[PDB]
C-alpha cells in the first residue's frame with residue numbers, strides 16, 4: 001500500500017538504537033505524522049526482526065488515549081518504516097531535563113495516566129518491559145502517551161534477547177534473567193515515580209556492574225524533601241519479590257495519588 005513517495009519528510013524528531021524518527025506529511029491528505037526509520041542491515045546484524053513484528057502487532061491493535069497509535073508500515077530493500085501518531089510536545093525525558101524535578105501535582109498526574117494505560121495493557125496480558133522517560137511522549141494537551149513497544153511480550157516470559165543499554169528501570173528478576181510477568185511494569189512505575197520527584201533514578205550508578213548490584217539488593221534512599229506519602233507508594237512498588245508489589249488499582253487509589261493527581265481513573 002504505502003511507499004516513501006507518499007510522504008514529504010521534515011525535521012528529525014529523535015534518534016534511537018535502531019530508530020531514526022522524522023516529522024512527515026502525507027501528500028494527498030496533508031496528514032501530519034511521525035515516520036520511524038529502521039535499517040535492515042542493522043536489524044539483521046542484531047537479530048531483532050522479531051521485536052519489530054511484535055511492535056507492529058501489539059501497537060496497531062491497542063486503542064487507549066494514553067497509548068501512542070501505530071497506523072501502518074512499509075519497507076524498501078534497505079529500510080523499514082513504521083507510521084506513528086505524532087506527539088507534538090515531545091518526551092517526558094526532555095521535560096525532565098528542562099525542569100530538573102517535577103512537583104507532586106505533575107508527578108502524580110503522570111503516574112495516574114501511566115497506570116491507566118498499563119492497566120488496559122495488562123488486561124490483554126500484554127507487558128511493556130521498557131518503561132522509561134525516553135519512551136513516554138506528550139500529546140497536544142500535555143497528556144502522557146506510552147510508546148516504543150519493541151520489547152513488549154505476552155506473559156509469562158523469559159528473556160531471549162541481550163540487554164543493550166541501561167539497567168536503570170529493570171527489576172531484579174529480569175536482570176538476573178529469571179522468569180517474569182506483569183509485575184515488572186509495576187517496578188518500572190516505582191523507579192519512574194522516584195525519578196520524577198528526585199531528578200534521577202534510585203539505583204543510578206557509575207558502572208553497569210555496580211548498578212546491577214544496587215538493583216538486586218534494592219539499595220535506595222530518599223532525599224529529605226520527599227514526603228511521607230510518596231515514600232510509602234515508592235516503597236510498596238520497589239519490592240524484591242514481585243508478588244508483594246501492589247495491583248494497579250491499589251496504586252490508582254493510593255491516598256497520595258488521589259490527593260495530588262488532577263486526572264481520574
Ligand SMILES: Nc1ncnc2c1ncn2[C@@H]1O[C@H](COP(=O)(O)OP(=O)(O)O)[C@@H](O)[C@H]1O
Nearest residue numbers: 013014015016017018019021034085087134148
Ligand atoms: N511519535 C513520535 N513523536 C515525536 N517524537 C518521537 C515519536 N517517536 C519517537 N520520537 C522520538 O524519537 C526517539 C526514539 O523513538 P523510539 O520509538 O523510542 O526508538 P527506539 O525504538 O530506537 O528506542 C524517542 O525517544 C523520541 O525522542
Ligand SMILES: OCc1ccc(Oc2ccccc2)nc1
Nearest residue numbers: 049052053054056057073075080
Ligand atoms: O507482523 C507483520 C510484519 C510487520 C512488519 C514487518 O517488518 C519487517 C520487514 C522486514 C524485515 C523485518 C521486519 N514484518 C512483519
Ligand SMILES: [Mg+2]
Nearest residue numbers: 016134135148
Ligand atoms: Mg525507545
Ligand SMILES: [Mg+2]
Nearest residue numbers: 016148150151
Ligand atoms: Mg525499540
